[PDB]
Structures are given as structure tokens and as C-alpha cells.
Write a protein that binds this ligand. Structure first.
Ligand SMILES: [Mg+2]
Ligand SMILES: [Mg+2]
Ligand SMILES: [Mg+2]
Ligand SMILES: [Mg+2]
Ligand SMILES: [Mg+2]
Ligand SMILES: [Mg+2]
Ligand SMILES: [Mg+2]
Ligand SMILES: [Mg+2]
Ligand SMILES: [Mg+2]
Ligand SMILES: [Mg+2]
Ligand SMILES: [Mg+2]
Ligand SMILES: [Zn+2]
Ligand SMILES: [Zn+2]
Lengths: 94, 82, 238, 100, 56, 51
RNA sequence: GUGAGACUCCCUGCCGCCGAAGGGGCCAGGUUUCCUCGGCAAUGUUCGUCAGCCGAGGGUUAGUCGGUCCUAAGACGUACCGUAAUUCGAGUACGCCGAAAGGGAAACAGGUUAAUAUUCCUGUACCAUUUAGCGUUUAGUCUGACGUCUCAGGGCAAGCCGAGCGGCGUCGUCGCGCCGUCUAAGCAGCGAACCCCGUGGAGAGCCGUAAUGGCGAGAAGCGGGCGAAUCUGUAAUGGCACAAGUCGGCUUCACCCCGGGACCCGUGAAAAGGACAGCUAAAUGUCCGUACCGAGAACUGACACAGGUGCCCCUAGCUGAAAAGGCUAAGGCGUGUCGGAGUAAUUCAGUUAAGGGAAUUCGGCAAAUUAGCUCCGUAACUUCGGGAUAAGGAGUGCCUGCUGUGUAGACAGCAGGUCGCAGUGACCAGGGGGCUCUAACUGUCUAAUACCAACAUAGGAGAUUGCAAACCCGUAAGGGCUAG
RNA sequence: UGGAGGACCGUAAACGGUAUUGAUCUGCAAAUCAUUCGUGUGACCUGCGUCUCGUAGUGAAAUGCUAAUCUAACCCGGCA
């Protein structure tokens, strides 16, 4: 279903395009960022894992076309989640 | 300030007398409309178009294609080119 | 006259240090609203702003004035934007901070009333409304300063979109080169110790060193105020 | 105007006929990398198009219903078959056609 | 590549055109000013006291 | 094929017709005391100060 | 032959150079160098009857090609304001310019001259504006109008193959080799993908693509609409020795249409113009450029300069991965403008050199070795990406006959025979490895003695500043950073 | 299968200019030629346009470059 994750080759991940350059720390950071960004994201409207990046901070649900502005690499940031749940508590409590 | 100087006669300029055309040396400041109007005033013959060009000697050569037949030969005879 | 610093060249305003102003989408500011007035509008599209490397929302209001807006996080297409004091405290809304409950996050804050938004505009930054008083209101800015602002200073609720942009390491001089193409900044920058003594205060010598203390006074003239300008302290946290 | 003395091509045509038969093409004449003489993506393209066309014709004439045609299509996607002949031999081995 | 005859074959363009007001090839094509008479900068003709010597 | 306007071609025309020798009768009339002028030139030399 | 005068000019033949540039087209630039005639005092690295020279005369024709029009980076003007003052200065408001390679209303084939040609002539067209007749707005949108990489489908120039037909070459024997067998815009018609609409009802899942994918928030299937390049028909008489002039097939780039995907802390221009209400008639379509070179002789470097501008855009057959290199077309040339002579030393650049093989030298400097492709195999160390073409090896031609994949071009493979010292037979084309120092790496650098360990870099850290800020420019008006 | 990379090999495409301390050094050339070399999908090369300049500009920083001129250009003037 996926690539031949070879007996040695699941360390570089997507950052094997950089070859041996740029050191292990920066390659690890960029590989983790690509893994976090490329994962499926459930849309808030249609609730289907279809949200995908279109630009720097722009995300779009492929099914319902719900285009929204989020993080540069992650759609929903934890601070925005904190703000939304704070307003949710304020609306529920009163 | 006449636009017409004189008819232009070379071997190539006399090659168009059979074609009803007649090539003139005109004032370089003039345009096609002024050459057409001044030729029609000077000889009365009607002109169909004007093919103008400026040469490297500092002059302008105009070729007037007439409408009535034999107007080029008539003008050449009246001027004495032929 | 030893040669003027890079800061003096930048202040003179030469093409090397000028921003490519034609590359940017639009100046970001809050819509102009008369006092005791309001306007609604809907998002017609999320675009990309080269000036900030973050999304900006194209908002069509009720008077038909298509105005680019700074995009808070979570704003989408077809959302309704509201302005004025009567506007509900909701993410993406433009309201005075005097109506915002304490503890909320705001961004694109105005220094003065009807300012257009000065503070809290980078990708992901936010401010916290701390306290409410009759003539004042405290907002905890992204730096950390408890700035005191007027109660009528508008601000859009929510954190600025594009959070996490600096999380990715640059990883390559070409990537930062391509970012700095659309910027006003000079890239790359030569270290001052590598310069000759005519060019910088710190240049010259048989070996790379300043030769003088890098902490410069606040009362230094232009062309001398380099290094650590007016430092309270130096070094890592011992 | 004197005649054009164009480059003759009879020896070239003789060599082309021999090459068409399969000769004059050994490893001493191959000078370019295997991948320039024949690209790999074109080989995949022709192979998968032949396999999908054979499966489409089998599903069209009723010899291959949708339940096994879908599996065979995904198998041809996954590279289980080497050619149309290999697909036919596997079909006649595991009997995926609706023989009646 | 050199600074001498190698890079002097790139002189296929102009920086001064023939000025209207004086007929001299001194009209800069970028500043729009003739550097001999000053047409395009002033109504008067540029003339300076250092163009000749002190008369004493 | 440099693309001249009208005045540039007029200036090149005057430069072209300046580049001709003195007539023979001028030399004969002047007792051969006028045999040249400064405007003689060749195209494969110092370029024109025309355009 | 010409000429008084011939290595040097002209014709013929032979032998040659370039042939992905030394050929073809044109920007900037040159400015008549273009073409015909007549000369050789100077120019030409010799002479010269020759000539980009000297002298005389001639040559450039536009509604359709460009400029013109539009706006971009960005200039300039007027006013305000500043300045001792201005021809000086930032900003603002109103204008105006800014691209012969961005946007863009429209023309093609053949002929003609010594030199002009999508311009002149023949044929067949098309575009715009205004005037008149006949009626209407849909008027707010679309187009103009967009980056990089990668790829599918369709078409086509160029190329190639088979049959017939017409000429030329070869013809010691053979029956082959070469050339040609042509047909534009405009007008009329069909329309592949994508998109939209009407039905449809798919899950112990089905439909697809090269690949990603799509689907009850409605897939497959069936219809319909919108819709390309090209193709077909006409233009059908033009040119071809009025000689054939008719056919089939393959391939098709780097050209055109169309669609998909991926990437971005890069988001990849604007405006004029154009479409949606036009149809018919007539007249008008001014001005500028148009020759010629575009470079080992027409530019620039003092020059007929081995540089640079231009390798900026195109370039046929064979070999071959190839536009590499070699050999040939077409085309351009024998002008990278001195000849005879074959007799030393020495010298610039090459070929070969017994036995030894770095003993030379500051130092393997130079030269030599190896070299393509397929297959086997590949170590230390490592940031797990690499090192790696590591290293170390085998095969390779030609002929006879076949097989497999593909729709096809073509690709891959096998059996037997056979020649040579040698089968990537020429051309083409890494020598390899180990241990240290230094810098992480790609990059940048003393144009004209230093391509380095220096500079930059990502990474790390520190400092100032809450924006009427920090920092900086200006005498000021006012500005850069900052559409932050 | 896929087609990422300041990835690799590589041209007499383009750009650069290592070594021969070869040729040349009153040269083809006021720095060029031959062979040998580095980059050659990007911090790339380059046409045209436009802008930044003298105690000033530009500089991946050598006091390099700013018209064969640079630890302060060039022209005229102070200057006999
Ligand atoms: Mg004209
Ligand atoms: Mg100092
Ligand atoms: Mg005086
Ligand atoms: Mg050859
Ligand atoms: Mg001589
Ligand atoms: Mg204009
Ligand atoms: Mg280094
Ligand atoms: Mg360093
Ligand atoms: Mg390379
Ligand atoms: Mg210099
Ligand atoms: Mg002096
Ligand atoms: Zn959704
Ligand atoms: Zn002037």
C-alpha cells in the first residue's frame, strides 16, 4: 500500500531528497513537518478527511470546497483551538 | 510651397510608364493627401493611390497610380519626358 | 570619511534597500467606518500576501467596497464579517477592545481609534485583553509588554493566520534568498569584522576582531551605533 | 543547374533491414544507457495499456464480471502480470472467466 | 574575460543622443538633460566661470 | 537594420552626400589651390556623430 | 580565356574546408558598405586586370510586416511646499512618457528587377473608422492575463519506407543511386479533453488514469449542450522543360492544441484592445522604417584585430544516447589574403621508441594509463541520505535462423557458423585506492600574477524597539525600512 | 509505479578561468590562443529597459568595481 520502507530507510522519510546535506537535525525537523502537514485533516464543515494545503496558510476541503486560512503547515493550531473552546465555554455557560 | 518638384526619370522610373504610373520628386514635408491634391490640381488627372518613399539623397519619391487610362503618357508628353 | 554603513545606505533610500512595493497585494487596514456606524461583509476568497508570507482575505462588504483584510486563523470563504461596537465578539470580527471580554485573543490592534490596525499583525501572533478600565484597557502584546490602549481601539478577534511559519528551518541559502527577493532586506549580509576599517567601525586588523566593545552607547552618532546598541546586558542566560 | 549529389542511402537501408530483423544490434553496438534506448515509463505505459484493454474487452464480452474484473484491474495496477499473455495464462489457471 | 579590448565590444548602445537645442551629441538619454547646453534642465544655457580661466 | 526616425535618416543622408570629392572644375578654377575639404571620410573608420 | 602585364581575376573539370556552424533569419550598431559600369597613384600583410578601395550612375514603394496604441520597473512636466536662491530637493494632486523580444484588429500563393517586395503586378481575400438604411443592449462579467518542474492524449513542419510515372548518374559485371512526382490564406463543415444540464441508482465495494484519484454532499451507464489544433471540400489556376504531376505506410521533435499532477516562509504584472446586436452599400486607412552587413572583412575593440557583441533564433543523411566527435547533402567558400624550394643546426606543435619504470623533480609538473554499454560484485566510515561508476571482473564484431513485449515505431533475448594481433577495432570516452590538515556542503572572490583554508551560507546566540517606535537619510519640505 | 533535489555525468549551448608557471610577450590580443579544467534546473546564465555615484554609489568584502583610471574616479577651474 506504501513505499518499500527498507530495512535501513525509515529515518530520512521525505527528507531523502536533500541527500547527505544540511545535517541530521534540520533534516529531521523538515521531515517531521512534512509528515505532520501531509496527513489527512478532517474538515470542520463536511467532517471528512479532505482538507489539503493550497498555499502558505490556505487550506481547502476537496469535497465541499471549504477554503479557509489556518497555519502555514498545519490547518488548525492549538491557540486557535483554545480560543474556539474558550468562546464555546462562554456561550454554553451563559 | 508646392508639393511637386519634378517628375523622376531613371531606367526604373520609366519602367512604370507602361503601367500608367509616374514617379515624382516631391517636397519631403508633404504627405500622400497633399501630393494627390496638388497633382490633381496641376494636371486635372485623377489619382488612385500614392506610393511614397524617402531616399538616402535627402529627397522623397512618389509614384501616383492614375485611374483614367493613358494619363501617365499624356502627362509625360505634356512635360516632355517621353 | 570612512564609508557609510549599510544602515546609512538604507536610510538614503537606494534601490538595493527599497521594498519591491509593486509585488504586494494591498495595504492591510480595517475598513473606514464613521462613528456609530457599522458595515457587514462576506469573504470572497483567501489569497496569499507576498508582503507578509501569510494569507489575506478578500472581503466584499455591504456598500460594495471590495477590501483586502488581514486574515485571522480559521476565517473561510462565505463567512460574514461585522464591524462596529454592535458587532458580536466573534473570530474574524472587527470590534472595539472595550467590548472584548478579558482573556480573549485579538490581533491587528489599533494604536488609536480609527487607526486601521498597527500591532499584532505577523503570521500567528496574537494579543490578550488583560483589564478593562473607564479610560484605558490593557492588552498583553506578543513581545510581552502590557500596552495600555484606548477602549475604542478596534481589533479583529482571533490569532493571525499562518501560524507556525518559522517552525521550518530554512535549510538552504536558496530558500531564504527566494524569500528575500520579495522583501526589502539585503541578502546576503557580510559580517563587519570581514570589512576593511574604512567601511565599518569593527573592520580591519591582522585578525578578525572588533578591537573595541560591541556594546555601543545610546548617545552614539549615526554611523557609529552598531554592534549591541544600548544593551541592558549581554550573553546567554547564565 | 547541376544535379544535387545527395547522400546515398542504399547501404543505410540494407543496415536498417538487418536491424529490423534483429541483427547488427548486439552489445558491441549498444552505446547508450539502458533507459535512453528505451525509456522505462514508456514500457510501463504500453504494458499497462495492453493489460487494461484486455481486461476491458473481457468485461465487455461478459467473460469477466465486475467482482473479479475490479480485482484484476487492481492486480494489473500493482504489477502482478508481465503481459497480456501472462494475464491470459493466469486467467486460464485460476479460471476467472464465466465459462458456461 | 578582461577590462580592455574584451569588454569593449559591448559598445553597441548609446548614452548620449544628439540634443535639439545645440545639435551636439550630449543629450543624456536617462536624465533627459544635455550636458553641454543644459536643455531639458533649464531655459537658460549652462555656462560656468570655470569653463574658462580667471581673467587676471 | 537600425530603425531610424525621419530626422535620423535625414542626417545620415546629409552625411552620405557630404562624403564626396571636390568637383574637377573647382580644382581647375582655383588653380588647384582647393583640392580637398575636411568632410571626406570612409564608412569603416570613426563613426558618424549623427544619430 | 581576358589582359600590355596573371600563383593570385573569369569559365570548365579535378582535389578540398565548414556542414547544430564558417549555412539560413534578424535586434542593437554601421550608414550606402547594396547593384551596374570604368580604373589600379594610395588601401589589401605579396601581386592583381580583382575588390567592402577609387570615380560615375542607380537602388528602399505597405490599411494587413514593425513603429504607431497600451501599460510595467521607472522617468519627465505643472502646481503646492522647501531652499539665501535656483537650472536644486522628498512627498502629494493632476497629467504625460516609458518595450522594434511584454499586451496587440486584419494577407496569403505565384510573378517581376541589376539592385525592392507578405509593400509593386496577377489571382483570391480579410481588418478598422466614419456616413446612410434596417433594430436592439446581456452591462456586468469574460478575455487580454500569467511562475517552476513533470507527464498523458491529439495534430503537424522536418524526416523515413513501398508501388507506379518523368529526367540525371553509373554501366569492367550488376541493377541500382539521386532528383521530382507540388497547391497558400480566406470561405463552409465535423470536433478530442475539460466543463455544464436531464436521467440513473453503486458497497461482504465499484469506475478510472501514465500517475495522483472519483463516488448517496450521488459512481458506472444512457442522452444533450458548449468545445481545439489539424483534416476534408472549395480557392482551380498558379508555377513545373505545357515531364510526370497519381498513391499507400511509418515517425514527428525542440512546433501547436488540450488536460492532469506536484512545489513554494518564492504566489509568479498592469493597462489598452477584444466578446456578448449586428447585416448591406460607398468612401477613407495620414506619418515613420523598408537597400545592404549582422560578423574569422560591413558592429565594437586605433586595423580587412584569433577578442567581445550573437550561438540570439533555426539547421538535412549515416554512425551514435545525442544538437558530442567523424564522414557527407543543401548552402557558403579555396580570403581564418604572400608564394617557390626540399639543403643544415635550432625552434612551436605532434607520432613512435628497446631494457628499466619516478632512479627526474621543490613536487609524478608535463606526458602516459583507463574510458561506451550490459551483467556479476562492491569495503572502511556515515548525519542512514551516502560512500558508489567504490574496488575487482566477464561479455561485445560479422553472417545464418528465430523468439518475447508493444497497436506500432522500436526494444530485449536465444541458437549455430565464421574472420582478425585487436570487435565501445576509427571518433568518442573516469586511472584507482589509503592516511592526515582545512572549510560543512551548492555558491562568491582580487576584470589584467592570489578560485584559497578567505567571503557568503543555513544553524546558534545576543542587543534595540509597542509603531508618532528602534535604526537611518535630508539644511528644510519631507523620507528609507514601510502596501511592514 | 512515481518523478523530488541550491542531486550526478556531460558538450567548443551558456557562464567561469584550475594547471601547462606551454604558445605569444615591439603579440591575433594594452591579458588572447591551445590542451587541461569548475558550474551547467538554479544563491543559474543572459538580451533589452530602468534605477543607485565621488568622502558618494555598489560590493557573498578583494580596498574589489564605478568606461584600459580607484586606500577617494574623470572634466574644467583655484594653478604659472
Ligand atoms: Mg512607407
Ligand atoms: Mg572608524
Ligand atoms: Mg574672473
Ligand atoms: Mg566535414
Ligand atoms: Mg599591393
Ligand atoms: Mg508608449
Ligand atoms: Mg568551501
Ligand atoms: Mg567564513
Ligand atoms: Mg557538470
Ligand atoms: Mg577600469
Ligand atoms: Mg589643475
Ligand atoms: Zn469540507
Ligand atoms: Zn544640447
Amino acid at each position: 500500500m506504501a513505499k518499500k520502507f527498507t530495512k535501513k530507510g525509515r529515518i530520512s522519510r521525505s527528507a531523502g531528497r536533500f541527500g547527505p546535506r544540511y545535517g541530521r537535525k534540520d533534516r529531521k525537523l523538515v521531515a517531521d513537518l512534512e509528515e505532520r502537514m501531509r496527513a489527512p485533516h478532517v474538515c470542520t464543515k463536511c467532517a471528512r478527511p479532505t482538507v489539503e494545503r493550497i498555499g502558505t496558510g490556505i487550506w481547502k476541503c476537496s469535497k465541499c470546497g471549504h477554503t479557509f486560512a489556518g497555519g502555514t503547515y498545519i490547518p488548525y493550531t492549538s491557540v486557535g483551538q483554545t480560543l474556539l473552546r474558550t468562546m464555546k465555554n462562554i456561550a454554553e455557560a451563559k | 510651397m508646392s508639393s511637386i518638384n519634378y517628375p523622376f526619370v531613371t531606367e526604373k522610373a520609366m519602367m512604370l510608364l507602361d503601367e500608367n504610373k509616374l514617379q515624382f520628386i516631391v517636397d519631403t514635408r508633404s504627405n500622400k493627401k497633399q501630393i494627390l491634391e496638388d497633382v490633381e490640381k496641376m494636371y486635372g488627372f485623377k489619382v488612385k493611390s500614392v506610393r511614397t518613399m524617402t531616399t538616402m539623397k535627402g529627397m522623397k519619391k512618389a509614384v501616383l497610380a492614375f485611374e483614367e487610362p493613358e494619363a501617365a503618357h499624356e502627362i509625360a508628353t505634356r512635360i516632355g519626358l517621353m | 570619511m570612512g564609508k557609510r554603513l549599510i544602515s546609512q545606505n538604507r536610510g538614503r533610500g537606494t534601490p538595493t534597500y527599497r521594498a519591491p512595493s509593486h509585488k504586494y497585494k494591498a495595504d492591510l487596514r480595517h475598513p473606514r467606518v464613521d462613528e456609530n456606524s457599522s458595515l457587514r461583509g462576506e469573504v470572497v476568497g483567501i489569497e496569499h500576501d507576498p508582503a507578509r508570507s501569510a494569507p489575506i482575505a478578500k472581503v466584499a462588504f455591504e456598500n460594495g467596497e471590495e477590501l483586502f483584510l488581514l486574515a485571522s486563523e480559521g476565517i473561510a470563504v462565505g463567512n460574514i464579517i461585522e464591524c462596529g461596537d454592535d458587532a458580536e465578539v466573534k473570530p474574524g470580527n472587527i470590534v472595539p477592545i472595550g467590548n472584548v471580554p478579558e482573556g480573549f485573543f485579538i490581533c491587528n490592534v489599533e494604536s488609536k481609534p480609527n487607526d486601521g490596525g498597527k500591532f499584532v499583525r505577523s503570521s500567528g501572533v496574537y494579543a490578550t485583553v488583560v483589564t478593562h478600565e473607564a479610560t484605558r484597557t490593557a492588552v498583553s502584546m506578543p513581545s510581552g509588554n502590557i500596552k495600555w490602549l484606548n477602549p475604542k481601539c478596534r481589533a479583529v478577534v482571533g490569532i493571525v493566520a499562518g501560524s507556525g511559519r518559522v517552525d521550518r528551518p530554512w535549510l538552504k541559502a536558496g530558500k531564504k534568498y527566494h524569500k528575500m527577493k520579495t522583501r526589502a532586506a539585503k541578502y546576503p549580509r557580510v559580517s563587519a569584522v570581514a570589512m576593511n576599517p574604512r567601511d565599518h567601525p569593527f573592520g580591519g586588523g591582522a585578525w578578525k576582531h572588533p578591537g573595541k566593545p560591541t556594546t555601543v552607547s545610546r548617545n552614539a552618532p549615526p554611523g557609529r551605533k552598531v554592534g549591541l546598541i544600548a544593551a541592558r546586558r549581554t550573553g546567554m542566560k547564565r | 543547374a547541376k544535379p544535387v549529389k545527395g547522400v546515398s542511402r542504399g547501404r543505410a537501408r540494407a543496415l536498417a533491414a538487418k536491424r529490423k530483423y534483429g541483427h547488427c544490434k548486439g552489445h558491441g553496438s549498444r552505446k547508450g544507457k539502458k533507459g535512453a534506448r528505451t525509456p522505462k515509463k514508456e514500457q510501463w505505459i504500453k504494458k499497462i495499456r495492453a493489460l487494461r484493454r484486455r481486461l476491458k474487452e473481457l468485461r465487455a464480452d461478459g467473460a469477466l464480471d465486475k467482482s473479479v474484473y475490479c480485482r484484476l484491474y487492481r492486480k494489473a495496477k500493482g504489477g502482478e502480470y508481465r503481459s497480456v499473455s501472462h494475464l491470459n495464462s493466469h486467467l486460464e489457471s485460476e479460471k476467472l472467466l464465466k465459462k458456461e | 574575460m578582461s577590462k580592455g579590448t574584451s569588454s569593449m565590444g559591448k559598445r553597441q548602445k548609446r548614452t548620449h543622443a544628439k540634443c535639439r537645442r545645440c545639435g551636439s551629441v550630449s543629450f543624456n538619454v536617462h536624465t533627459k538633460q544635455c550636458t553641454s547646453c543644459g536643455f531639458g534642465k533649464t531655459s537658460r544655457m549652462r555656462t560656468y566661470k570655470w569653463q574658462a580661466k580667471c581673467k587676471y | 537594420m537600425s530603425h531610424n526616425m525621419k530626422g535620423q535618416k535625414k542626417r545620415l543622408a546629409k552625411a552620405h552626400k557630404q562624403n564626396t570629392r571636390v568637383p574637377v572644375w573647382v580644382i581647375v578654377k582655383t588653380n588647384r589651390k582647393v583640392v580637398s575639404h575636411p568632410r571626406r571620410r570612409h564608412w569603416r573608420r570613426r563613426s558618424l556623430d549623427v544619430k
